[PDB]
Amino acid sequence: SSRLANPGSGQIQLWQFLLELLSDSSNSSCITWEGTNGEFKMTDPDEVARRWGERKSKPNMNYDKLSRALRYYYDKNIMTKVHGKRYAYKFDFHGIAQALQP
Amino acid sequence: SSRLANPGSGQIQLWQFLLELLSDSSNSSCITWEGTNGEFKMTDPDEVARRWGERKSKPNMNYDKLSRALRYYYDKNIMTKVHGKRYAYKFDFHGIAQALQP
CB-based contact A94 B19, cutoff 8 Å: no
Please tell me the distance from the alpha carbon of residue A48 to that of residue A64, in angstroms, as a whole number: 12
Put simply, the answer to whether B97 touches A7 (Cβ < 8 Å) is no
Helix (H, G, I), strand (E, B) or coil at A40: strand
Looking at domain B1-102, its CATH class is mainly alpha
**Within 13 A of A15's CA, how many CA atoms are on the CB side?**
26
Q: Are B87 and B45 in contact (CB under 8 A)?
A: yes
Q: Among A45, A52, A41, which Cα is nearest to A79's?
A: A41
Angle between helices B63-71 and B14-23 in degrees, nearest 10:
110
Q: Does A92 touch chain B (CB under 8 A)?
A: yes
A9 touches chain B (CB under 8 A): no
Strands B88-91 and B79-81: antiparallel
Beta bridge partners of A90: A39, A80
Could you tell me the sign of the dihedral formed by the alpha carbons of B83, B85, B86, B90, in that order?
Answer: negative
Contact criterion met (CB below 8 Å) for A19 and A94:
no
Q: Which residues contact A65 (CB under 8 A, 6 or more apart)?
A: A49
Q: How does DSSP assign chain B, residue by residue?
A: ------TT-TT--HHHHHHHHHHSGGGTTT-EE-SSTTEEE-SSHHHHHHHHHHHHT-TT--HHHHHHHHHGGGGTTSEEEPTTSTTEEEE-HHHHHHHT--
Q: What is the number of CB-based contacts under 8 A between chain A and chain B?
A: 55
- Backbone angles phi and psi of B86, in degrees to 5: -90, 120
Resolution in Å, one decimal place = 2.1
- The DSSP letter of residue A39 is E
